[PDB]
Nucleic acid binder design. Structure first.
Ligand SMILES: O=P(O)(O)O[C@H]1[C@@H](OP(=O)(O)O)[C@@H](OP(=O)(O)O)[C@@H](OP(=O)(O)O)[C@@H](OP(=O)(O)O)[C@H]1OP(=O)(O)O
Lengths: 52, 89, 183, 141, 30, 35, 98, 97, 229, 31, 243
RNA sequence: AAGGUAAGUAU
RNA sequence: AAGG
């Protein structure tokens, strides 16, 4: 009767929590939103570096 | 420049790949993944009903340079359609 | 699409498609036949699909599944055909199902005058047809029986037909000639 | 009721929700003059120091700040909502509304336990936590 | 920050990506 | 954790404005501020 | 509490009609407490077997000072044998509710 | 049929003592697979089947979850019969003429 | 006479006595007329119509108002039929059936409109020639004597058990004063005045509550001994 | 064969339609 | 539960830990509380499971989630189907089966109680003689109704409550509903539907039968129920939850 | 009429 | 991915 919580992964780019297994992680990463967030993060990193 | 809606002259092979198994890897793009895919709208749909909804959607017709408006038919062409259909059989 | 065409006018003070119950309309809109062969249909395309009809009926099965006849009826309600188009559907002689579809549309949207002017002359047809029951079973009836149900039964093919002024009431005011049967 | 910090516009509420990354943002939506809100605010004031390690409490006037009335259905005399890392953490209180505490509590330990449960569940990455106590009844005998 | 005024043209709903909820239909201005 | 002193005073002033069953001379409803 | 009361007033309860109504009311109150602890909505009918079964068999070991009927629909059970499945009932010959 | 080099210190102690590291049975091996979540389950295979939705509409769906995907290698399947017919000359040497 | 009609007599007398005791003289007021002020504004016009036509118009307008209320949060999975029965178009999910929740006021208004639809439909059936005048009267009497069966008003306001019980008592009184002598049991009693009065007196008191609820919902905007410390 | 059976069925349907018309007229005649 | 009784815990932690006795009590009597006769209302089907909740019984729902973790329902259905596949493979010549095919199905096929498809497809070398539909226990088969060359087998799992745990009635209703509706599609009209009551360990089968199918499948299903691995996992999980 | 919403990520 |  002991409750074992399934591991959860937090996607920093999308700021969302997903299940920590290969299927869910790969489905999230393959999605359009994750790719858009990754590209936006890269652009923001470049902009911050240039501003600094 | 949105052309009026037209009927699909071709049937959709919803049941073409029944029973088949498709192997998908990380490298495989959306083109060859399992389910239904439309290049016109570049999307993947894993249902027959949802694929029918998609190909009947506004965005899919818009990507075809088309509009959801259906032209109002005329009497002469309806009568000619009757005549040609009667002649065919 | 799914909505009524812009140029269409209201029928019986409501939307033309609203003559069918919202339950049945929702079931038809979600049917495979409607999404596949009824995405875009003009009068020509409706004529093309009408001849492929093999039976007349409403919905069947435990879950509400519409027949192609009901889907075509709802499509013609959606995209309004002119009255002469309905008459040409009725005037058809080779195909019984196209004439029945036209008669059903005339009963649904036509005036009480039209329901007797254009559908009563169809009593001369006695061609055998197949009708699908609500249990999915098929039964044989005739064209005249379907016309009689259209003119006298409140619900035909799982559709509550609009009210008709009774034939004797129409005859008394003498705006419609009394029906003279062939026999 | 008056010793707690107040937020005077919707932008302040958004910033307060956004600012705290490691603490639960407990925000009470209502009016300082409403007796139910007075009870709830007294309860929150009694626990404000205790839960300051993992919770921060703010009060918002829904007439001065009406920017969340339609959004959060703030049409009750008192309402307490929980946010953690810019996410509204729902709680299964057993009242049928899992989004807020729309009544006034009387036990400090009750509210502290609810705050702790929300904090733990939100840290684990959950959008809904189950309250340690059910509120389908008032336990009045 | 407390005391600071709201910037002009700021919507307190979508400014932080907040999502609302509906418990019932008899509550709320349509 | 608690509000500053001037903020406490302002909050109490708002409460007194909106609570005429406790403060003021004339007594309006519990939530009203006109009187 | 109930046996402390009853073993004390063993002979005096029966003539005390106000106590009989109080015992039933309190028993129903605690049964309602258990029921609402189980689910929020009240059951239309809740079997006494879950309450009055001895704790050894998994029940609550409840003691009763009231008139509680057990529906005959709650006295039937079935077990699967090799030849088939056989149905059994308790209190046969169509007796009244136990 | 194991190498002594790969045995760990705890395994060596168990061997020296009477502790028995018994191989799990075929039933026990199946139980462990069912009891535990699939190891690093990879949905590398998509299967399309004819199903119905929650509203009773026949639908063709492509699914990748690795459930109801076990293959039954029957004695009639040609893959098994191919290796069965391999080395068939064994039955040829011994005959009942 | 049977026990039920005697209890009917006693309950009617109880209602009469309670009304007599609880009577208070009307409070003095300035004469303000709602319909006269309707005429003052430009939004209302006056005409003369047959009562059946106005009944159909009011039924349609109430149906439209309820449909506007139902599809307020774009809840497209709830369908209101023309007999004022709220039914789902599909098999609703749990969240769907939770968000499709209406208060007791909405359902009370729906059942009130359902009663009006029943009355207007009976009158229309009389006007269409489908039913006789005696049949129309008997149907109207059955409507008011069986509001608890035809409509579910008591579910959303249990105080209507008073009106329902009063209607049952009046039905017993009129039937046992009516089905006497050569006249036996069965349909055809008519004499629907009593239940009609009862339900109109219910409406004169239920009107302000529904007015307030509808006004709040349709608008653009939606002691010492306890907290003395 | 098939044509004769179809003609018989059509005649039966016509007789039924005549009977239905007579019944419809008699409905107003009696009332 | 014993170890945490003597550890430093907050009030919320201890309050959460006092519910395990209540969870054990609720799941012990679950076939009685979780009834449509007891809790009149709509049913909600538990996700990943064939269990219907007749009311929000979170004390029972939480403990039912543990028992059917790691897709236990799907694994049980798959194991039973596979075992029947081996059973029919071992009897190819005696039963005149030309091939035994395990049909490809939806991953959630065991979950869908609205309709179902065939699980195992049997092909005959020559046309079989098919009996009228009858229960698994029944032995009076005329065995002369019709003939067929394709035979299908349907495996149904259910979690019966106290009132509804007649597995024979369930099998009869499921066979007469799925084979006569417009939702369930089957390769051939003739086939058998096998229903398993996981909450009561009752098994039955209703449908047509070809010569030798019923006598084999009787002890086949008996042995499957006695010694299934996934069924054993379910039994052990229930025992551990019940202590 | 309720106290019977899993929280999601994808399309 | 589709609906107003
Ligand atoms: O309210 P009750 O006195 O029980 O009336 C019911 C019944 O009513 P229901 O349809 O609600 O069951 C009929 O009354 P009406 O519906 O006709 O008003 C019937 O009346 P008749 O047979 O006289 O037409 C008869 O009432 P009565 O006692 O006057 O015969 C009968 O009563 P019982 O149920 O007591 O037989």
């Amino acid at each position: 009767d002991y409750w074992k919580s399934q591991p959860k992964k937090f996607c920093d780019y999308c700021k969302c929590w997903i299940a920590d297994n290969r299927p869910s992680v790969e489905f999230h990463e393959r999605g359009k939103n994750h790719k858009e967030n990754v590209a936006k993060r890269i652009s923001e990193i470049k902009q911050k570096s240039l501003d600094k | 420049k949105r052309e009026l809606l037209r009927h699909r002259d071709y049937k959709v092979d919803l049941e073409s790949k029944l029973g088949k198994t498709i192997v998908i890897t990380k490298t495989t793009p959306q083109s060859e993944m399992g389910g239904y895919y439309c290049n016109v709208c570049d999307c993947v749909v894993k249902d027959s009903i949802n694929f029918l909804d998609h190909i009947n959607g506004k965005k899919h017709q818009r990507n075809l340079g088309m509009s959801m408006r259906v032209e109002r038919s005329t009497l002469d062409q309806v009568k000619k359609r009757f005549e040609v259909n009667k002649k065919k059989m | 699409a799914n909505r009524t065409v812009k140029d269409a006018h209201s029928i019986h003070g409501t939307n033309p498609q609203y003559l069918v119950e919202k339950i049945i309309r929702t079931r038809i809109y979600e049917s495979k036949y409607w999404k596949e062969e009824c995405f875009g249909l003009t009068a020509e395309l409706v004529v093309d699909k009408a001849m492929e009809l093999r039976f007349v009926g409403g919905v069947y099965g435990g879950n509400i599944k519409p027949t192609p006849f009901l889907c075509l009826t709802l499509k013609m309600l959606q995209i309004q055909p002119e009255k002469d188009i309905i008459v040409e559907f009725i005037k058809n002689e080779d195909f019984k199902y196209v004439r029945m579809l036209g008669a059903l549309y005339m009963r649904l949207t036509g005036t009480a005058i039209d329901c007797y002017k254009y559908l009563e002359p169809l009593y001369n047809d006695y061609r055998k047809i197949k009708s699908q029951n609500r249990n999915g079973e098929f039964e044989l009836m005739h064209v005249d029986e379907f016309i009689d149900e259209l003119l006298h039964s409140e619900r035909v093919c799982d559709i509550i037909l609009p009210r008709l002024q009774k034939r004797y009431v129409l005859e008394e005011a003498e705006q419609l000639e009394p029906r003279v049967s062939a026999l | 009721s008056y010793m707690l910090p107040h937020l005077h516009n919707g932008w302040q509420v958004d910033q307060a929700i956004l600012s705290e990354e490691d603490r639960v943002v407990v925000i009470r939506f209502g009016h300082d003059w409403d007796p139910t809100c007075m009870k709830m605010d007294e309860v929150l004031y009694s626990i404000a120091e205790k839960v300051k390690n993992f919770a921060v409490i703010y009060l918002v006037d829904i007439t001065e700040v009406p920017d969340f009335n339609k959004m959060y259905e703030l049409y009750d005399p008192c309402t307490v909502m929980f946010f953690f890392r810019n996410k509204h953490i729902m709680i299964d209180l057993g009242t049928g509304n899992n989004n807020k505490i729309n009544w006034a509590m009387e036990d400090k330990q009750e509210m502290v336990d609810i705050i702790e449960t929300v904090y733990r569940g939100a840290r684990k990455g959950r959008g809904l936590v189950v309250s340690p106590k059910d509120y389908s009844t008032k336990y009045r005998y | 920050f407390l005391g600071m005024p709201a910037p002009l043209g700021y919507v307190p709903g979508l400014g932080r990506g907040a999502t609302g909820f509906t418990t019932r239909s008899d509550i709320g201005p349509a | 954790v608690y509000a500053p002193g001037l903020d406490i005073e302002s909050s109490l002033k708002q409460l007194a404005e909106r609570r005429t069953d406790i403060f003021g001379v004339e007594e309006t409803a519990i939530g009203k501020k006109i009187g | 509490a109930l046996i402390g009361l009853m073993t004390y007033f063993r002979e005096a309860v029966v003539n005390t009609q106000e106590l009989l109504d109080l015992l039933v009311k309190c028993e129903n109150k605690i049964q309602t407490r258990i029921k609402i602890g189980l689910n929020s909505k009240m059951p239309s009918r809740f079997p006494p077997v879950v309450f009055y079964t001895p704790k050894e068999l998994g029940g609550l070991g409840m003691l009763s000072m009231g008139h509680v009927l057990i529906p005959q629909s709650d006295l039937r059970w079935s077990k699967q044998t090799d030849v088939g499945i056989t149905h059994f009932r308790s209190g046969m010959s169509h007796e009244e509710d136990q | 049929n194991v190498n002594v080099a790969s045995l760990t210190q705890s395994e060596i102690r168990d061997i020296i003592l009477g502790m028995e590291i018994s191989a799990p049975s075929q039933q026990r091996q199946q139980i462990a697979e069912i009891e535990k979540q699939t190891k690093e389950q990879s949905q590398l295979t998509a299967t399309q089947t004819r199903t119905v939705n929650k509203h009773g509409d026949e639908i063709i769906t492509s699914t990748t979850s690795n459930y109801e995907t076990q293959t039954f290698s029957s004695k009639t399947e040609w893959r098994v019969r191919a290796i069965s017919a391999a080395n068939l000359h064994l039955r040829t040497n011994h005959i009942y003429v | 006479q049977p026990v039920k009609v005697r209890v009917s007599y006693q309950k009617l007398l109880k209602y009469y006595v309670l009304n007599a005791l609880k009577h208070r003289p009307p409070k003095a007021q300035k004469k303000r007329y709602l319909f006269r002020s309707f005429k003052a504004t430009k939004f209302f016009q006056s005409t003369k119509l047959d009562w059946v036509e106005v009944g159909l118009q009011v039924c349609r307008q109430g149906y439209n108002m309820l449909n506007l209320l139902i599809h307020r949060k774009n809840l497209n999975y709830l369908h209101l039929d023309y007999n004022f029965n709220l039914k789902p178009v599909k098999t609703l999910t749990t969240k769907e059936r939770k968000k499709s929740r209406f208060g007791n006021a909405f359902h009370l208004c729906r059942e009130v409109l359902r009663l009006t639809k029943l009355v207007v439909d009976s009158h229309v059936q009389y006007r269409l020639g489908n039913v006789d005048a005696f049949q129309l009267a008997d149907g109207l009497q059955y409507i008011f004597a069986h509001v608890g069966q035809l409509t579910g008003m008591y579910r959303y306001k249990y105080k209507l058990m008073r009106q329902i019980r009063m209607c049952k008592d009046l039905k017993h009184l009129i039937y046992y004063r009516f089905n006497t002598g050569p006249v036996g049991k069965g349909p055809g009693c008519g004499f629907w005045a009593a239940g009609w009065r009862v339900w109109l007196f219910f409406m004169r008191g239920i009107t302000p509550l529904l007015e307030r609820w509808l006004g709040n919902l349709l608008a653009r905007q939606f002691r010492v001994e306890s907290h003395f410390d | 064969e098939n044509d004769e059976e179809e003609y018989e069925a059509w005649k039966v349907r016509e007789l039924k339609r005549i009977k239905r018309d007579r019944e419809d007229r008699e409905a107003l005649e009696k009332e | 539960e014993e170890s945490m009784k003597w550890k430093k815990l907050t009030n919320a932690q201890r309050s959460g830990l006092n519910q395990i006795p209540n969870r054990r009590f609720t799941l012990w009597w679950s076939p009685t509380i979780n009834r449509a006769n007891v809790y009149v209302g709509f049913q909600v089907q538990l996700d990943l499971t064939g269990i219907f909740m007749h009311g929000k019984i979170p004390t029972l729902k939480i403990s039912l989630i543990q028992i059917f973790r790691a897709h236990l329902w799907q694994k049980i259905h798959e194991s039973i189907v596979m075992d029947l596949c081996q059973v029919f493979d071992q009897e190819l010549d005696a039963l005149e089966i030309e091939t035994v095919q395990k049909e490809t199905i939806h991953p959630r096929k065991s979950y869908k109680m609205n309709s179902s498809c065939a699980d195992i497809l049997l092909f005959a070398s020559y046309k079989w003689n098919v009996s009228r539909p009858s229960l698994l226990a029944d032995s009076k088969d005329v065995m002369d109704s019709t003939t067929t060359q394709k035979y299908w087998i349907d495996i149904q799992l259910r979690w019966g409550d106290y009132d509804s745990h007649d597995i024979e009635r369930y099998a009869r209703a499921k066979f007469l509903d799925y084979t006569t509706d417009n939702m369930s599609i089957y390769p051939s009209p003739t086939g058998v539907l096998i229903a398993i009551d996981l909450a009561y360990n009752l098994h039955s089968a209703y449908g047509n039968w070809f010569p030798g199918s019923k006598p084999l499948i009787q002890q086949a299903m008996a042995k499957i129920m006695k010694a299934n691995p996934a069924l054993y996992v379910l039994r052990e999980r229930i025992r551990k939850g019940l202590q």
